[PDB]
Amino acid sequence: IVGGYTCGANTVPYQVSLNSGYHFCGGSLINSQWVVSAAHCYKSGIQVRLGEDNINVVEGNEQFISASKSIVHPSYNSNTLNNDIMLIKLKSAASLNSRVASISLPTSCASAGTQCLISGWGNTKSSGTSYPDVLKCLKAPILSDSSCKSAYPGQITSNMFCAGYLEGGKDSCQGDSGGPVVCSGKLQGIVSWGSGCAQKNKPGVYTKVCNYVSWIKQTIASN
Ligand SMILES: COc1ccc2[nH]cc(CCN)c2c1
Ligand SMILES: COc1ccc2[nH]cc(CCN)c2c1
Ligand SMILES: [Ca+2]
């Protein structure tokens, strides 16, 4: 997260870190057994780390649970990033509490102008590299579909939306991939892609979670 703020330990209780020897992506806990992330975060050997603040220090609220199964969306295209969503099932159920909590799925899509919270352990610099230990947060509005498409000609599908600041300076970045965009208490987005980070006229692009709720629910119901 570039241009954000330190969230505060365990204040984003649905935020997970996906770990394969190191943090490599975010995700969102949606029930005691399941995490939603980006399809571009797929790899084998994932350990889901819940209750994290400092990802390099055991602080006492973590739960570390290995994935039993990953399900990339059937229509994910890794060249265009269309349908950039994946589900991860935990080998055992997380113990839910005030610091490890699921985030509600949307019942309808969110509108341009809605304020959201984007979070992760990604790079905090737009030119250069610095990776934080503690979770970073950014409040950002959803942008209009028209401004999103104008910013990224030929690339925005009906399964994507932009959020952030056309002036630059505030954005998600590398390592925030797969993490949450939460608006009015609902998971509306997943950190998906963008041109650089925090660049003028190049806002972050996010998977439009509301399009996937039926797939998520039916997948959970049979897996
Ligand atoms: C865009 O950066 C990342 C970062 C972490 C990642 N893990 C696995 C993948 C590729 C998915 N098959 C990936 C990509
Ligand atoms: C500019 O390099 C990267 C590298 C990896 C990334 N993952 C997601 C994003 C977009 C964040 N808005 C991103 C950007
Ligand atoms: Ca920790």
Whether residue 23 has its Cβ less than 6 Å from ligand 1: no
Residue 89, strand partner residues? 34, 69
DSSP string, 173-223: -TT-TT-EEEETTEEEEEEEE-SSSSBTTB-EEEEEGGGGHHHHHHHHHH-
Q: Alpha-carbon distance 223 to 204, whole Å?
A: 32
CA of 214 to the centre of ligand 2 (A): 27
Cβ neighbours of residue 111 closer than 8 Å, sequence gap 6 or more: 142
DSSP string over 31-48: ETTEEEE-GGG--SS-EE
Residue 121 in contact with ligand 1 by CB distance below 6 A: no
40 has catalytic annotation: yes
Q: Which residues pair with 163 in a beta bridge?
A: 142, 204
Q: Consult the annotation and say whether 177 binds a ligand.
A: yes
Is the CB of residue 100 below 6 angstroms from any atom belonging to ligand 1? no
Neighbours of ion ligand 3 (CB under 5 A): 52, 54, 59
- Reported as half-sphere exposure (CB side, CA atoms, 13 A), residue 85 has a value of 25
Distance CA(154)–CA(24), nearest Å, equals 28
**What is the identity of the amino acid at 78?**
S
Q: Please, are residues 138 and 172 in contact by the beta-carbon 8 Å criterion?
A: yes
Resolution of the model in angstroms:
1.0
Paired with 136 in beta bridges are: 6, 120
138, with CB counted inside 10 A (0-12, 13-18, 19+), is buried
**What domains are defined for the chain?**
5-7+103-211 (2.40.10.10), 15-102+212-222 (2.40.10.10)
84: annotated active-site residue: yes
Non-local (6+) Cβ contacts of 179 within 8 A are: 15, 25, 26, 27, 28, 37, 118, 119, 120, 122, 172, 190, 191
Quick check: is 73 catalytic?
A: no
Closest CA to 209 of 160, 172, 163: 160
Query: Which residues does 88 contact at the CB level (< 8 Å), separation at least 6?
Result: 18, 27, 34, 35, 36, 37, 46, 48, 67, 69, 70, 71
Residues 6+ apart with CB under 8 A from 182: 14, 28, 103, 116, 117, 118, 188
Cα–Cα distance, 208 to 11 (Å, whole number): 24
Question: CA 7 to CA 120: how far, in whole Å?
Answer: 9
Residue with tokens 């660049």: 199
Residue of 40, 44, 86 best suited for mutating to test ligand 1, as the one with most atoms within 8 Å of CB: 40
Report whether residue 82 contacts ligand 2, using a CB cutoff of 6 Å.
no
In a 3-state reduction of DSSP, which class is residue 50?
strand
Task: Count other Cβ atoms within 10 Å, centred on residue 56.
Answer: 12
* Strand, coil or helix: 147: helix
Residue 49 Cα to ligand 3 midpoint, Å, equals 8
Residue 153 one-letter amino acid:
P
